[PDB]
Amino acid sequence: ERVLMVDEQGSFAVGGTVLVDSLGHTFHGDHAYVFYQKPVGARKYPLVFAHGVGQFSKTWETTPDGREGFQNIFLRRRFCVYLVDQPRRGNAGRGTESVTISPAFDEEVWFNRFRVGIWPDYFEGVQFKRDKETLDQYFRQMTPTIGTTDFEVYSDAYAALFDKIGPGVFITHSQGGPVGWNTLLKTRNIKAIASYEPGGAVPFPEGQLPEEAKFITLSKKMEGIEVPMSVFMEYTKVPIVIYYGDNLPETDERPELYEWTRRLRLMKIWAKMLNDQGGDVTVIHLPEVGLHGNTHFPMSDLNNIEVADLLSEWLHTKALD
């Protein structure tokens, strides 16, 4: 019986490039696609949401079991909400590269990687509905990259978006993490960043890469990267919060899950190093603040309203609401 009072809504492509062939003909690609809604009585700073690998805006929309996601929850709380499909993903599938896409039979691997459970079993107490239809939805919210992964291309489009809409808050997920870290260096208009379970390319000062950053992922990439000191200092300039969920394993028997344990450890080190240089980085491991059973997608888990309340609280204390 509640009602979302939408003052404005719409969609647009943002950013991208233009290829030009030998005849002067154009190809417009590599933009992001954005759908936005502005509530009546909107707060000063919009929220911009960025998904991770294999996913799209649906990350933040209806949950796989049919409940409201952050798109609806934050609109109801009077934030302008911008949902994005990054370059080469979903509705932004018009990339600039030639590419071959083939189905991969790794759905059961993703179940584990997302810490829903160890397939075929769900984790005890997991904040995820256990029926077949929910899982059907969960696998069908994946969509392929129509090209190669390129954080420069991705972050360029998000910078173009922040430049367009003005100062806002960037809410990211997983590989959205390093998209976020890159985008910060490209726009004045990011006021703050909240990231859910970031992974990849954590920036440390050259010569100060912590031992805990030197592990190489399953994706064959080193987790931490070295950046010049003046670039590292840019991450001290806005408030940052990072959230990790539950069922982080204690041993490395299954790297698909243990990588998340390593990431929690690493982000705490990263936060400490930035805070020692005057930053404002908070890392929250959800069970330690009373929320148990979260997966890699806390924004769509069964307790996602409680997850949203934590975010609203932080936004409030940073005067971003």
Place this chain on the structure above:
Amino acid sequence: ERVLMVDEQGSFAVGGTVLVDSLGHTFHGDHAYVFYQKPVGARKYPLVFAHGVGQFSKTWETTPDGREGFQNIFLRRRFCVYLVDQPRRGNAGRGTESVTISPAFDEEVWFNRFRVGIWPDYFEGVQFKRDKETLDQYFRQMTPTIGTTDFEVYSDAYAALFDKIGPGVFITHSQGGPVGWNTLLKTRNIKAIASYEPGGAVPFPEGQLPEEAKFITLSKKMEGIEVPMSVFMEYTKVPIVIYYGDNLPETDERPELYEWTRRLRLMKIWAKMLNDQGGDVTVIHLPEVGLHGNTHFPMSDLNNIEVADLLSEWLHTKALD
């Protein structure tokens, strides 16, 4: 200053299949993606919108020049609106086939095909904004098919959607036309079909294919198809309206545009044949009812509100509002 009062909104995947490999592992693909909004005080029958080739739900969203589209207009008029990305398109990019995608330098050809003008010139009086940013948006609302064109796969997902949401009205565009014609044969829940500039696979009774249907398109497909008489009779059972815009050329010097002239002619023949068998098919050529300058996308043209009023009127006379 107007406000859309949204009682419910959300998104889901619908339809699709499941591949199963030799090890019993799954691949869920070929679903459509749907975003829906239900207004306060919604009318009895939802509107379901289906795009054509190379496009996605954006067909019906914000126009390329930044004005409201049918998504907003019909929600404001108190219809539940379901916007769809059909299987293998956009957010529904998780298809079941291996495919190679490469950029094609045919943007200037599409400009002509859509009857905005003869590139580089706009048609005199065309209902399309003539600035660069508008055209940028127009090209970036294209997205590739992640697989092959298959009307069975497409129409199966739309049938699954109509089965899910109950009796509704199907609003289609271009190749959405034959998707519509196919979907009708697969669900009880289509109350009516409105189609903007349909093209392809127009069904006629076996042995009664009109001469005007026998032309082979640039896509190397015959425009009319032969179906059994009992199947042809299915198109008599719901009201159907078909709209064509302006700048239909009189001669065949440019097949990219003349195909639309042939289609207008053909749909009038099709309507006559169905109406003679008890159907209710109306074909409207927009200039002949006082709307001039429409392109192949009348729903997003400068006079799209007037285009919407025509549709609201028809819906009203068929008791579908």
